[model samples]
Target: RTCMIKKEGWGKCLIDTTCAHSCKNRGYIGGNCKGMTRTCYCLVNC
Candidate 1:
């Protein structure tokens, strides 16, 4: 499946849903994962 996030980051699919842990190194949140902090892992796979 294709990720909906626009920013650069790595979200590993955990369980059947995209949990906080799913936000691997991006430190993102929410389902679409559309938030940014002071620091983050900026790198997308698309």
Candidate 2:
């Protein structure tokens, strides 16, 4: 199943693509900037 959660050790994402790729590098399907702080949220469970 797909789950959304904050990406650790990262701050505000200026570009959504970077964050999305970052999550992918961490074995996640992908992710993007979200929430008030614009943090990266991965499309995978913890």
Candidate 3:
């Protein structure tokens, strides 16, 4: 199991690396741009 982190700002995902950065900044492990409209989901140690 893992924790899914939501983005701080509301916007379509741009870069996968940056998505991970945003999540990391929010205290998450990593993130990725996936699904429709570019949803951002992150991994975290919860």
Candidate 4:
């Protein structure tokens, strides 16, 4: 399974490393940006 955290209002497109930093800050395994939505999805194993 997967656990995710959705963060919005980035005001810009996210780079892979940028998302990863957020996830890491939240103690998640990794993260990604959902296209032009400016949302960051932090991912963790569940």
Top candidate on TM-score is: 2
| Top of the candidates by lDDT | 2
- Model 2 lDDT per residue over 1-46, tens place: 7776688567767787678788888878788887578798777655
Candidate 4 clashing pairs, residues 3+ apart or interchain: none
Q: Over the stretch 1-46, how does candidate 1's per-residue lDDT look in tens digits? A: 2233433354433332343344434544433333343222222343
Q: Give per-model TM-scores.
A: 0.20, 0.71, 0.65, 0.64
The residue pairs that clash in candidate 2, if any, are none
For model 2, state the Cα shift of residue 32 in Å: 1.3
39: Cα error in model 4, Å = 0.9
Q: What is the clash tally of candidate 4?
A: 0
> Model 3, 1-46: lDDT tens per residue?
5587666354558778678777777778887776565767677987
Task: lDDT for model 1, please.
Answer: 0.36
Winner by lDDT between candidate 4 and candidate 1:
4
Greater lDDT among 2 and 4 belongs to 2
Q: For model 4, state the Cα shift of residue 24 in Å.
A: 1.2
After best superposition, candidate 3 residue 34: deviation in angstroms?
1.2
Clashes of each: 2, 0, 0, 0
Q: lDDT tens digits, residues 1-46, model 4?
A: 6676775543333586687577778788777777867778777886
Ranking by lDDT: 2, 3, 4, 1
